[PDB]
């Protein structure tokens, strides 16, 4: 049970890390969708700075 507990601890940690990775990717995808949608030129030139 100690070995299984260690395995579960590691697995839960990695799953939370992957959840955060997916959350980051999702947020950036939404942002890129926004920038692809409307006001592309001026927004692109303004934001980078």
């Amino acid at each position: 049970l100690t070995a299984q507990d260690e395995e579960l601890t590691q697995e839960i940690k990695q799953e939370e890390e992957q959840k955060q990775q997916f959350a980051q990717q999702q947020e950036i995808a939404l942002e890129e969708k926004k920038r692809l949608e409307r006001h592309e030129v001026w927004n692109l030139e303004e934001d980078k700075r």
């Binding site: 980051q24 969708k33 692809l36 692109l44 934001d47």
Partner: protein, 49 residues
């Protein structure tokens, strides 16, 4: 206190990664901008989302 400071620093690092990714996205949209290119990139972003 150390745990709180490390959590805040990691939050800042995550935001920094997000901003780097958004700069990359701005550069990519600047390179790509074009009605056909915009359509394809919107489709790609939808698939990624």
């Amino acid at each position: 206190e150390l745990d709180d400071l490390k959590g805040d620093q990691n939050v800042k690092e995550s935001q920094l990664r997000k901003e780097k990714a958004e700069i990359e996205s701005i550069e990519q949209q600047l390179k790509l901008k074009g009605i056909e290119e915009v359509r394809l990139r919107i489709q790609q972003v939808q698939q990624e989302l």
